[PDB]
Every structure is written in C-alpha cells, then in structure tokens.
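Long-time lurker. I teach an intro course on protein structure, and each term I like to show students one example going from raw sequence to a predicted 3D structure in token notation. This year I'd like something fresh instead of my usual example. Would anyone be willing to generate the tokens for the chain below so I can use it in lecture? Attribution to the forum is fine with me.
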Amino acid sequence: LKVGFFKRNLKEKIEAGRGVPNGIPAEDSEQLASGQEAGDPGCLKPLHEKDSESGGGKDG
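-- Reply from a regular --
Happy to contribute to a lecture. Here you go:
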C-alpha cells in the first residue's frame, strides 16, 4: 500500500532546512498540521509531509 508516507523523509529535511516555498502564510497552517501529524498510523505521514513542504516559513 502506498499513500505518500514516503514523503516523510523527503520533507524530514525541510523541518530543519528551509521548506520549498519559504515565504508564505503556510506558517499558520503548519501550526495545526504539526499537531495533526501525531497520527499514530502512517496514513497521517502523507498528510503531514504536505504541510511540511510549506512549513518552510516557520522552519526558516
């Protein structure tokens, strides 16, 4: 099964790098995304990574 949890690693760097867009209001979105990533299952990994790419605003 593949949902996109693989992005967890691809974005794992963003959380410490500088995101992709870096320079958007995504920071306000990551606020809730970060807490939603708590998803015990991996199905949440693909949902958190998406917000991780934009999290660049808060990461940077």
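Some talking points for your students: The chain has four helices and no strands. The chain has one domain: 1-60.
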